[PDB]
């Protein structure tokens, strides 16, 4: 790491200086560092140049706006200060070079969209690893090699990706937020593939607004190295973009592939939602097949198909993907299915809002031949508004609502339950059982073999907050033990 080499693409004259780390934060800027002084929203890093110098940074790269011309090399207390125009725009490229282009030394797949990013990223990372990659993820859950994900500027992105390259990662599945993209946080990453789960947002009913939003996004897209484009054709915006991208892969489970285009495509032709997952029959430009997914609900069929289409597009052989699909697992505590011979199917999901609970129940219903049970409660000492809404949802979308406790904290547990019941048309038809473990047990032990019990609100969280006490408790463990299986 040398300032002169770092800057060679942009500034030919730059002085030679050994550099340690690259940081935007003057507070942590230490001896030998490159401090990068940016102008942000109500913050100007140039103000902190004297501090950084006093802390012994080897060099500084600074926003040129108002202060200097692009490429201008100055010197303050024997420290080179190099000014660059549009530094925010170029920060990704700058950090990329500094960290030896990590995205050129592994297969990076970006996933964008409002929903399904985490799941699709997890599936990409899992499936690629099943086929022999050392895979990693970067997303909302955290960053790391698979099974080692620990819970962010353009510099942080490149640095983290370099970290992963150093740990041996050959594949990385990255969640890309709309906000990250707009702020040029992934501007210089070489994506092998970019996956769109959707491109549809609220607040775009005026066609001028839809046009500006789309224009902004198309502009951003055109500036990035997206690689193979894999787009969900079941999304309306998805379809519009597919019409403009003859090389993009169209993915559908709802009959939106237009075969006249002769493009690359992948479509589920039939899905059987059953008591332990989904059997997905599909055709594609790569060949046809049948996958046994152990994920639940229609949305996860879509996510799986997107990951499949992506890996096919990257050249992973269909036969090997088919042979490994049954090993794909859900994100822990996300529509995570528990089955045991001759017992009801039990799904653990973290759904703890009206919208999430509704979606979870609708997903569970697809796999449910008998009655759908919903075991849930609401957090105490928190916003109470969702309580009757969750009651109404449980009553509507389940056949049996079992209302119980879920982190009652210092609030009277029964009072929370009463607020839930208040939301129902027929509270008397709900079952109430206090002690969460007892409520779970009640549903699981009474439910028929062909029933499904959704246990909602905790997912992977292994505690029940009663009073001030963080009591050891797991829905997953409770369910596993009742079914005689292992969590």
- Of 295, 327, 359, which marks where a domain is finished? 327
Residues 114 and 256 in one domain: yes
State yes or no: 151 annotated in a binding site. no
φ, ψ of residue 383 to 5 degrees: the values are -45, 125
Residues 111 and 260 in one domain: yes
Q: How many CB atoms lie within 10 A of CB 247?
A: 9
List residues bridging with 374 in a β-sheet: 401, 454
Assign residue 348 the CATH number of its domain: 3.90.190.20
Asked whether 309 and 297 are in contact (CB, 8 A), the reply is no
List residues bridging with 75 in a β-sheet: 80
State yes or no: 185 annotated in a binding site. yes
Q: How far is CA 112 from CA 22, 137, 303, 453, 474, in A?
A: 27, 14, 12, 32, 32
d(CA 246, CA 243): 7
State yes or no: 23 annotated in a binding site. no
**Which residues 6+ apart lie within 8 Å of 203 measured at CB?**
209
First and final C-alpha spacing in the chain = 46
State yes or no: 431 annotated in a binding site. no
Output the six-digit token pair for 323. 């042979």
**Which residues 6+ apart lie within 8 Å of 406 measured at CB?**
352, 376, 377, 378, 379, 436, 457, 458, 464
State yes or no: 481 annotated in a binding site. no
d(CA 164, CA 351): 31
State yes or no: 113 annotated in a binding site. yes
d(CA 296, CA 300): 6
State yes or no: 288 annotated in a binding site. no
H/E element, 211? helix 207-223
Residues 196 and 320 in one domain: yes
State yes or no: 414 annotated in a binding site. no
Strand-strand pairing, 79-84 and 289-293: unpaired
121: closest CA among 101, 151, 141? 141
State yes or no: 457 annotated in a binding site. yes
State yes or no: 177 annotated in a binding site. yes
214: closest CA among 191, 241, 193? 241
Residues 282 and 359 in one domain: no
Asked whether 378 and 386 are in contact (CB, 8 A), the reply is yes
State yes or no: 461 annotated in a binding site. yes
d(CA 4, CA 14): 5
State yes or no: 228 annotated in a binding site. no
d(CA 487, CA 257): 39
DSSP letter at 186 equals T
Q: How large is the angle between the packed helices 298-313 and 354-366, nearest 10 degrees?
A: 80
d(CA 294, CA 274): 10
- Of 97, 114, 141, which marks where a domain is finished? 97
Asked whether 342 and 156 are in contact (CB, 8 A), the reply is no
| Rounded (to 5) percent helix, strand, coil in the chain | 35, 25, 40
**Which position has the token pair 């031949």?**
369
State yes or no: 217 annotated in a binding site. no
State yes or no: 114 annotated in a binding site. yes
Method: X-ray
150: closest CA among 135, 165, 160, 162? 160
Asked whether 120 and 311 are in contact (CB, 8 A), the reply is no
Q: How far is CA 431 from CA 257, 374, 378, 395, 416, in A?
A: 45, 10, 15, 11, 14
Residues 178 and 147 in one domain: yes
- In 316-435, which residue ranges form alpha helices assigned H by DSSP? 318-324, 354-366, 386-397, 413-422
Asked whether 353 and 366 are in contact (CB, 8 A), the reply is no
Radius of gyration from C-alpha coordinates of the chain = 26
Asked whether 63 and 69 are in contact (CB, 8 A), the reply is no
d(CA 149, CA 155): 19
Residues 164 and 280 in one domain: yes
Q: How many CB atoms lie within 10 A of CB 307?
A: 30
d(CA 331, CA 479): 17
Asked whether 476 and 487 are in contact (CB, 8 A), the reply is yes
Asked whether 326 and 292 are in contact (CB, 8 A), the reply is yes
d(CA 351, CA 457): 5
Residues 225 and 243 in one domain: yes
Asked whether 459 and 334 are in contact (CB, 8 A), the reply is yes
List residues bridging with 81 in a β-sheet: 60, 74
State yes or no: 310 annotated in a binding site. no
State yes or no: 198 annotated in a binding site. no
Domain that holds residue 319: 98-327
State yes or no: 41 annotated in a binding site. yes
d(CA 38, CA 47): 10
**Which position has the token pair 């210092």?**
410
Residues 249 and 267 in one domain: yes
State yes or no: 315 annotated in a binding site. no
**Which position has the token pair 């969280």?**
461
**Which residues 6+ apart lie within 8 Å of 50 measured at CB?**
76
Q: How far is CA 245 from CA 151, 215, 257, 287, 431, in A?
A: 35, 15, 14, 22, 53
d(CA 385, CA 152): 33
DSSP string, 219-266: HHHHHSB--EEEEETTSHHHHHHHTT-TTSEEEESSS---GGG--EEE
DSSP letter at 295 equals -
Q: How far is CA 1 from CA 15, 63, 80, 450, in A?
A: 13, 21, 15, 62
d(CA 426, CA 410): 28
State yes or no: 85 annotated in a binding site. no
Residues 287 and 342 in one domain: no
- Of 55, 70, 97, which marks where a domain is finished? 97
State yes or no: 119 annotated in a binding site. yes
Burial (CB < 10 A; 0-12, 13-18, 19+), residue 408, is buried
Residues 223 and 280 in one domain: yes
State yes or no: 382 annotated in a binding site. yes
Output the six-digit token pair for 98. 């500094």
φ, ψ of residue 373 to 5 degrees: the values are -100, 145
Strand-strand pairing, 289-293 and 277-284: antiparallel
Output the six-digit token pair for 436. 């969460």
Asked whether 309 and 267 are in contact (CB, 8 A), the reply is no
> How far, rounded to the nearest angstrom, does the alpha carbon of residue 38 sit from its chain's CA centroid?
28
**Which position has the token pair 């009072």?**
415
State yes or no: 200 annotated in a binding site. no
Residues 29 and 146 in one domain: no
188: closest CA among 148, 229, 159? 159
d(CA 80, CA 35): 11
**Which position has the token pair 């907050």?**
465
Residues 258 and 182 in one domain: yes
φ, ψ of residue 302 to 5 degrees: the values are -55, -50
154: closest CA among 184, 182, 191, 113? 184
List residues bridging with 385 in a β-sheet: none
Assign residue 228 the CATH number of its domain: 3.40.1190.10
d(CA 27, CA 200): 40
Number of domains forming the structure of the chain: 3
d(CA 266, CA 251): 5
């Amino acid at each position: 790491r040398n300032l002169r080499d770092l800057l060679a693409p942009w500034v030919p004259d730059a002085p030679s200086r050994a550099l340690r780390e690259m940081t935007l934060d003057s507070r942590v800027a230490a001896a030998g560092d490159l401090f990068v002084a940016v102008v942000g929203h109500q913050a100007d890093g140039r103000r902190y140049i004297p501090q950084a110098i006093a802390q012994g940074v080897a060099a500084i790269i600074a926003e040129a706006k108002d202060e200097a011309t692009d490429g201008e090399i100055r010197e303050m207390h024997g420290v080179p200060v190099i000014y660059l125009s549009q530094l925010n725009e170029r920060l990704s490229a700058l950090a990329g070079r500094f960290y030896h282009e990590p995205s050129d030394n592994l297969r990076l797949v970006g996933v964008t969209g409002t929903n399904g990013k985490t799941t699709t990223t997890q599936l990409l990372a899992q499936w690629s690893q099943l086929l022999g990659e050392i895979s990693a993820v970067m997303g909302t859950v955290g960053n790391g090699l698979l099974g080692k994900v620990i819970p962010g500027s353009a510099v942080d992105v490149q640095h983290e990706l370099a970290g992963l390259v150093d740990q041996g990662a050959t594949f990385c599945a990255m969640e890309v937020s709309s906000h990250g993209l707009v702020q040029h946080r992934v501007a210089a990453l070489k994506f092998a593939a970019s996956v769109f789960t959707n491109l549809s947002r609220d607040h775009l009913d005026y066609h001028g607004d839809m046009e500006h939003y789309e224009a902004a996004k198309w502009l951003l897209y055109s500036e990035h190295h997206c690689g193979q484009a894999i787009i969900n054709a079941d999304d309306e915006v998805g379809r519009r973009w597919l019409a403009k991208l003859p090389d993009a892969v169209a993915v559908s489970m709802e009959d939106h592939i237009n075969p006249n285009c002769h493009g690359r495509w992948l479509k589920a032709t039939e899905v059987n939602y059953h008591d332990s997952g989904a059997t997905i029959r599909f055709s594609s430009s790569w060949g046809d097949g049948e996958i046994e997914s152990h994920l639940m609900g229609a949305f996860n069929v879509s996510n799986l198909l997107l990951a499949l289409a992506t890996l096919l597009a990257l050249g992973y052989p269909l036969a090997d993907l088919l042979k490994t699909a049954a090993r794909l697992q859900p994100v822990c505590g996300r529509m995570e299915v528990f089955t045991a011979p001759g017992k009801p199917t039990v799904v653990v999901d973290y759904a703890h809002t009206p919208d999430a609970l509704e979606k979870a129940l609708q997903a569970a219903r697809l796999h449910c031949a008998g009655k759908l049970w919903c075991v849930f409660g609401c957090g105490g000492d928190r916003d109470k508004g969702k309580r009757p809404l969750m009651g109404a949802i449980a009553e509507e979308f389940a056949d049996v609502a079992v209302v119980t406790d879920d982190n009652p904290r210092t609030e009277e547990p029964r009072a929370i339950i009463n607020d839930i019941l208040a939301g129902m048309l027929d509270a008397g038809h709900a079952k109430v059982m206090e002690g969460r473990a007892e409520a779970v047990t009640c549903a699981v032990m009474q439910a028929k073999e062909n029933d499904v019990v959704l246990v909602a609100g905790k997912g992977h969280e292994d505690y029940q907050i009663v009073g001030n006490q963080r009591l050891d408790y797991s829905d997953r463990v409770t369910v596993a033990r009742l079914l005689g299986v292992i969590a």
